[PDB]
Symmetry: C3
Subunit: 237 residues, 3 copies
């Protein structure tokens, strides 16, 4: 067998995650989202979004925008717990970290003050932070101050996963692989089976900050936001 | 950002759960239950159950009754492990804690000697313990001695979750959101697709007390009990 | 209530698992596999496989063979992390432990150098190691040196589970209950709903060794291998 020392990114990520689990009470709430309406909006909007904003329109900014709005309407999730002083801090800014798969390991660059950004500014920030993280061109400020994380677990086809949150953060939302499924729809009391583009949306939360019912209300706001798919003015094409 | 000290319920719940994970070997077994027959029984029985027993008939007492019977036929699950003496204690009483979402945080009031109660007495005990927990009118004895916990994770629409068990308890059963799904049914070798009211029933267990095959046998007894839906004499209308 | 001391198998298994979670960063990636083609191959091959190799042909050796090939093409998964020296060791041999449910508790006997075995030799090794583990006739060498574990969580009907990996191992793959499901198939752009024999394939991995994208690539190789079901020359009937 052969041995090699890991780089500092993998060494620090591993140590931070081993420690994270020992100082928090993590659970993974499982929710699902019907992404069919967003998939149709995305298909027709991709050429116009590429021409006006210079980036490829993916599902991730839809999830990030819905999460940012939900972190503002559920400020109890955009919060941190201090086990020594037994105090909760509800953060004014929404600093969303984006998990980026890089050749050197996982990096989670932060979109600071994401509550002040438009949908296109979020899409451009994801592309910019990911390109710089993959080229290992991030400033130290780019990895500090996260209040929440969104991880694209579906990039390598995972149906779901149990993402690890890292205190002081209280939640991490996963955007699992969007797959066609046989699901029940109802219209005027008529239950029927449709083929819909669904994805699991696991949400790992720390019971020190968020209880199970709070996690449920939080993902219900995001689920309803994405399923309604009222993003035409957000796309601003 | 703003800071406030958490109440004693949230402070103690958080600390007990952080510690629980460090002194146990928790896994979450995933099972599903076809609740359609119970849903039909419940719909027709609700007016008569409200008139005779004074409570609204929900799915929770069906799960609690099936769990109590299964804790009596699987006494290895109604048990506790002592890591110092390397001893297992199989408890004579079935003291089922019910997770209640309250304005002050999660409370888990205990139905002591639940193996001695009728189905209506269990339904009335859930309503009574929940009302008192929400009004913070519980006696100290009401929160002690639990041998098992049942948590209604479906109250805020969760498909599933990974509930945290708290030693000395060895299992916690979740009753996730009952949703209409496209599922396969078989009759005389004819596989067909039906619309059924299904729910995931996650079961978190401590490998110190219950192994994976034991968890499977335990949830199979409960799954079969609920799917058969022979609760007419239990409803006693 | 009654108390009895647990045997050494259950005492050591429990302690090793409590410790395993505290010194690793475990996540459970969720994947699914369409086992219908393997189920059809297995049904027609069982009489000939029993006559030539002397064992009953089950799904488990298909999963083990696909996992062994994937541990050779993904050598980053057949690896161990040393948190003190911050070094990764990629193991030359694939020593697959098989979780066996025994009357005395869980035992995980190891198939050493599984990369050097034929599909029938793997099927015969599972039967041999399981029979000896159930009769508690294992040599000490039979439980040492595992680089990966495969656990048949579906034996007692579990839809899925979150198996606990034990360092220095970096992954544990679960073969959950194969159940008939309503799933979408596509042929020349025609989406349609079929009844397929599916199973969840949870994969618990240590973020100290394997990141989420690596876990996804690893299970995608296994998923594609089993779904293609090109096992005729492997069966060698
Ligand atoms: C930086 C990153 C998050 C950007 O994600 P993104 O905005 O979706 O962009 P990508 O360039 O990777 O997307 C590639 C394509 O796959 C699609 N896609 C990405 N994730 C998807 C998912 N979960 N389900 C379905 N389609 C998805 C995108 O819409 C895009 O489609 P298109 O080419 O048809 O327009 C991503 O590259 C990445 O690193 N993902 C891995 C995150 C990670 O490591 N998480 C840890 C757990 S795996
Ligand atoms: C105390 C408590 C458990 C009682 O549960 P209950 O017996 O189902 O009673 P509720 O009054 O809450 O039920 C409201 C209605 O929703 C239904 N319902 C409740 N849980 C359900 C579920 N999992 N799936 C579908 N329907 C459900 C009930 O049947 C009832 O329906 P009806 O009005 O048509 O008769 C509940 O109020 C509660 O606190 N739940 C949250 C538990 C918790 O915090 N768990 C932690 C993880 S979220
Ligand atoms: C040793 C062991 C792994 C062998 O598994 P195996 O090769 O599938 O063999 P078994 O004799 O147990 O299989 C019995 C039958 O069920 C089938 N079966 C087993 N697992 C199955 C699954 N996940 N889904 C569907 N069918 C399955 C087999 O194909 C066989 O079918 P057949 O009689 O029609 O030919 C198994 O006996 C065992 O101990 N399983 C439990 C493992 C465990 O404890 N894991 C911990 C988490 S539960």
């Amino acid at each position: 067998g052969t041995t090699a020392k890991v780089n500092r990114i993998r060494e620090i990520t591993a140590a931070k995650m081993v420690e994270a689990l020992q100082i928090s009470a993590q659970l993974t709430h499982l929710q699902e989202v019907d992404m069919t309406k967003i998939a149709e909006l995305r298909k027709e909007s991709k050429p116009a979004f590429q021409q006006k904003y210079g980036v490829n329109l993916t599902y991730l900014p839809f999830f990030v925008k819905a999460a940012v709005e939900a972190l503002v309407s559920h400020p109890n999730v955009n919060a941190s717990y201090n086990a020594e002083t037994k105090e909760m801090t509800y953060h004014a800014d929404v600093n969303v970290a984006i998990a980026v798969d890089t050749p050197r390991g996982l990096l989670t660059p932060v979109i600071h003050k994401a509550q002040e950004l438009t949908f296109p500014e979020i899409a451009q920030a994801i592309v910019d932070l990911a390109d710089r993280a993959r080229n290992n061109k991030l400033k130290p400020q780019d990895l500090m101050g996260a209040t929440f994380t969104i991880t694209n677990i579906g990039s390598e086809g995972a149906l779901s996963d149990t993402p690890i949150l890292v205190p002081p953060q209280a939640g991490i939302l996963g955007t699992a692989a969007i797959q066609k499924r046989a699901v029940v729809v109802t219209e005027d009391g008529v239950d029927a089976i449709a083929i819909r583009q669904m994805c699991y949306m696991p949400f790992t939360y720390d019971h020190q900050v968020v209880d199970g019912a709070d996690a449920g209300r939080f993902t219900t706001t995001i689920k309803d936001r994405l399923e309604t798919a009222n993003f035409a003015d957000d796309l601003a094409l």
